[PDB]
């Protein structure tokens, strides 16, 4: 059973992350749920303080915990949301000015545009071919081997693995949404 | 550098397998080189014994040693070949009658058809998008987690990961070539 083997694999090798959204980091156009599990976009930017930790250009928010070591996974209910990008980024990313979200710029993210265009946000972007659109996505980090990978968390099918790299400093769970859609992104608890 | 990270990741996690081909398993249309590292195809079936372990239908050959446990990798020079498939199969796969080469039938393989069509031999087959056609492919096995994955061995880019599974019995390196063409399939030594 592919669900069973996915469950047994993630349990054997990856620490289960309990990820909550940090509204202090969130671009002003983002709405973070009271339980800090769910992410929607506002109509327009809210008036929030431009504290140094807040994303002011990218429509990004971070988790409340970073990783400097170990294997970690978390799963995100993306449901039928037609646009979303998730993964990890370095503590030291540019949060204020425009930069391309690329591994070179400290972002390892994949996701969906316009309902049907899956991409890895590599440089240049990798067009994914996804036979079964995921409803829940597992994010898998191995700090020591520089590994960031993504799976369909319902059927265990692989989506994308970045080239193995070298990480500098802490890695944060990162979430980006560009559009207004009925379906929020929701983090599954550990 | 992605090559260096690829080298450090296989060193951290995977035991380098020294794979040689077992000519007694090779379909009678295949030629195994005397050093048992290279594979070619004949114009017709040659006259060989139909010993039980020989693939009579599928243009396959196994390695000389199996895996019942652990993390293992080997790399295969596919060069400019227009057709090839490689991966692992269970000891108990059908050798004589036709079976579809699928995980359900005990086969975990990916490869190339008609020079440009990269596929995983899932059921259904998964169409791959590969930006840089590999000359050398890394095959990565984790027996315990039921993981088979494939990399471009030269630049470290990921090709394909099968859904995690549960293996039954020993796994063998398997190699398949269907075409009569100038470039051999060559295994890289450990
Ligand atoms: C406006 C915006 C993001 C769009 O960035 P880009 O337009 O660079 O596109 P992508 O390839 O999706 O990163 C806010 O995060
Ligand atoms: C004739 C032959 C193999 C072709 O099998 P199939 O025609 O099932 O094709 P594939 O999807 O490539 O496995 C001998 O191994």
Residue numbers in the entry:
A (entry chain B), B (entry chain A): 324 to 513
Publication excerpt:
Vγ9Vδ2 T cells—a major subtype of human circulating γδ T cells—respond to multiple cancers and infectious diseases in an MHC-independent manner; they are specifically activated by small, non-peptidic diphosphate metabolites called pAgs. The sensing of pAgs in target cells requires a surface protein, BTN3A112–17, that has both intracellular and extracellular domains. Here we show how—in both humans and alpaca—multiple pAgs function as ‘molecular glues’ to promote heteromeric association between the intracellular domains of BTN3A1 and the structurally similar butyrophilin BTN2A1.
We found that HMBPP, DMAPP and IPP bind to VpBTN3’s intracellular domain with varying affinities (KD = 1.37 µM, 92.7 µM and 96.1 µM, respectively).
